[PDB]
Design a protein around this ligand. Structure first.
Ligand code: FMN
Ligand code: FMN
Lengths: 346, 346
């Protein structure tokens, strides 16, 4: 597997937007034998390029860069904005523009990734045109795409990608569904089941994602057909993580004892710890991405500035309670040991 | 592990009510080295006892018997019944009595299980008084209880049970939650995550349940801390299964491409293939068990009699598409081979 041949351990640090995946995090994972990732989501092409440059200065080992697929245009947003009037007033800020870009600098970002190739590139919220994948392949870049159902996985393979990321419902953060509709609500697939379905649906390598916090779980997905495990929440609380202090603390806080998928913050299903904002607006959030994300960004930044976890997008997978606060490099070592220990037992 | 010492393969055939787990099914699983189960749910104490007697005549190997915990009493039911008036008329039958028993012959069933001990007894919909568990233990019976969260698992251990069954959201049929409330809605835990949480929460053996259809998935849960895998849907479509023909056929029917948790049929969250009945009544089903189950039984029986899968409780886990129609004994062999193959690879 070209992917696994790139790095020693079957461990991938999930790209996490919102200032989480700073170069220092990716670098530590890379130096420990795992695959570090940079998140291009919501950044400008230049912002992404600067991180890429900095990371190369921190490590010479393979790393990945994640990009968001452009979303098509399209009452609901006007109403939700109105319902947030109180949040804007309380945080003394203005809601963001729901009609901003929807491509997230896609064209410019691909230009950078093609002109100065990186080892790995993954896509979220859909599948790239097969010409984008072919061109990146020629450049020597391995391509990955997230799928949440066996059908989406088939689409990923059909596009010619090198590997598919099977993200189960337990996953923290944004669900990588290709198309969001109120019907998918309540129909999310558990990772162990999704992995098996995807493994029999496609022939390309599968990277398992969702709720993986221990080395034993990494051994579990490998046993079920995965080539590697992608972990987000586990690295979210490491020291190199750029996630706000209130967010890191919430992960193990008994007060935030539950997570759930919501469109409250971005307008697309994403798993977050249940808090005030989710409770109040979660039931009414419309399917409109990145429209809603633009709308609530000022709110989230204001909340983070104040240290108010109740107004933040507390992204977290179902294994958040097992999050460990230590250097990412040491976390990889611990994970590797747990993995070995589980293989031996099995 | 006293449990695993009982039978050679880490495979448990889940007890399945509704006439699915006939003695012939349990026997075939037992003879193949797995642990067969009889379902006492909704049967009378005598009905259960007759199956127990018959199964002993079919195999001398260890088997289990599953019993439902009595439920406490408690507008919603009156309204739901009204909404089903059309179903009753169409199927030309009368709705059942929502105020029937709620103990499901618990006292009488325990009397039988204590007077003539069986190898294993599992409980669903709660945890038995620790005196019930202690008495069964003295009789030489191993006890298991289903938990859906790490907290419920702790309760299972605290009661002194020999092992806990960690049932994830992917599971087919009835969720074994100890207490049902509209809050749990949307907060189900994926098996891979639940298993890890339960393994660190308790010290007793864990049996993993939910979406397991292949031997590789059995290797997966074992690697994550489970002592065995409990499979329902995989055995539901075997020849020895007593499930109606329309139910077995629906499992691999492209028309029924999705499952979801609903209270439509029983008044408690249970995963079923999405069909007409679920679509029409699922959004309005109240939390009232076994009240709703009593209410819809006549409807379900009428639908089954007519071969109308759209009016049946098509219980099925998320791996239903991988269901194989063959003797249960051969399914165990195939599962065992897949398991070995996965261990070797890992
Ligand atoms: C903090 C937060 C931010 C995330 N941001 C991204 C992102 O920008 N792009 C992406 O492809 N996935 C993103 N993910 C999803 C991860 O790729 C992965 O699917 C998820 O973290 C797996 O669950 P645990 O978090 O490992 O349960 C994010 C997840 C969280 C935790
Ligand atoms: C046909 C149907 C009926 C079931 N009946 C029972 C039951 O009476 N008692 C019980 O404890 N579990 C029952 N279960 C749940 C199983 O114990 C197990 O948790 C579930 O089948 C696991 O998922 P798959 O079905 O293995 O995904 C039933 C499941 C289905 C498939």
């Amino acid at each position: 597997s070209a992917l696994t041949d790139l790095f020693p351990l079957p461990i991938v640090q999930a790209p996490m937007a919102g200032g989480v995946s700073v170069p220092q995090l990716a670098a530590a994972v890379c130096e420990a034998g795992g695959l570090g990732f940079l998140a291009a989501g919501y950044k400008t092409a230049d912002g992404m390029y600067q991180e890429i440059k900095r990371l190369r200065g921190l490590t010479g080992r393979p790393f990945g860069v994640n990009v968001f697929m452009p979303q098509p245009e399209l009452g609901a947003v006007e109403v939700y904005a109105h319902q947030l009037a109180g949040e804007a007033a309380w945080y003394e800020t203005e809601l963001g523009d729901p009609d901003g870009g929807r491509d997230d600098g896609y064209d410019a970002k691909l230009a950078v990734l093609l002109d100065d190739p990186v080892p790995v590139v993954s896509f979220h919220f859909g599948v790239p045109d097969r010409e984008v994948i072919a061109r990146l392949r020629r450049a020597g870049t391995l391509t990955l795409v997230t799928a949440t159902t066996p059908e989406e996985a088939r689409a990923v393979e059909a596009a010619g990608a090198d590997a598919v990321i099977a993200q189960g419902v337990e996953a923290g953060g944004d669900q990588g569904t290709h198309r969001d509709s109120s019907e998918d609500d309540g129909a999310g697939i558990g990772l162990l089941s999704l992995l098996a379905q995807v493994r029999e649906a496609v022939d390309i390598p599968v990277v398992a994602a969702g709720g993986i916090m221990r080395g034993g779980q990494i051994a579990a997905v490998l046993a079920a057909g995965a080539d590697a495990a992608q972990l987000g929440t586990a690295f979210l609380a490491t020291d190199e993580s750029g996630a706000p202090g209130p967010h890191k603390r919430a992960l193990t806080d008994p007060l935030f004892a539950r997570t759930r998928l919501t469109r409250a913050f971005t307008g697309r299903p994403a798993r977050s710890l249940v808090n005030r904002f989710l409770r109040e607006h979660g039931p009414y959030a419309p399917a409109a991405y990145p429209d809603v994300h633009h709308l609530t960004s000022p709110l989230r930044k204001a909340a983070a500035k104040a240290g108010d976890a109740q107004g933040m997008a507390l992204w977290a997978g179902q294994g958040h309670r097992m999050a460990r606060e230590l250097p990412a490099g040491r976390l990889v070592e611990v994970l590797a040991a747990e993995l070995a220990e589980a293989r031996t037992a099995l």
